[PDB]
Amino acid sequence: NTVSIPCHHIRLGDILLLQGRPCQVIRISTSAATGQHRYLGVDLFTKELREESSSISTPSPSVVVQTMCGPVFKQYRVLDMQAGHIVAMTETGDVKQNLPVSEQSNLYERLQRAFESGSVRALVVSDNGRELVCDMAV
Secondary structure, three states: OOOEEHHOOOOOOEEEEEEEEEEEEEEEOOOOOOOOEEEEEOOOOOOOEEEEEEEEEEOOOOOOEEEEEEEEEEEEEEEEEEEEEEEEEEEOOOOEEEEEEEOOOHHHHHHHHHHHHHOEEEEEEEEEEEEEHHHHHH
């Protein structure tokens, strides 16, 4: 349920797990004392601000790895759209009747636009069992 992401590949707007919750990164800084990077982000589900500092590992001599964890995004087919949510289907055919859609960057209107023109995929993040369409693909 976690993707390891090197810090040097993390940019503003990326979605990371911060304190275990999927958050859109809004500020990146570096600790003067430790060298760790600090990520400030907005919880995609609750919109609270959360921060978390990178983990530093040294697997081999002279290799210093700083990483953060990103969520695993699932790709769901979009079968219908109604009332700000979608009806989705997983790869195996499991129907999700009532998937909410992130308010980020006019996602639902863009989804609806592409839906109206079976190429759309909803990109879904999970947190504590709750699923949220947080991006789209065609």
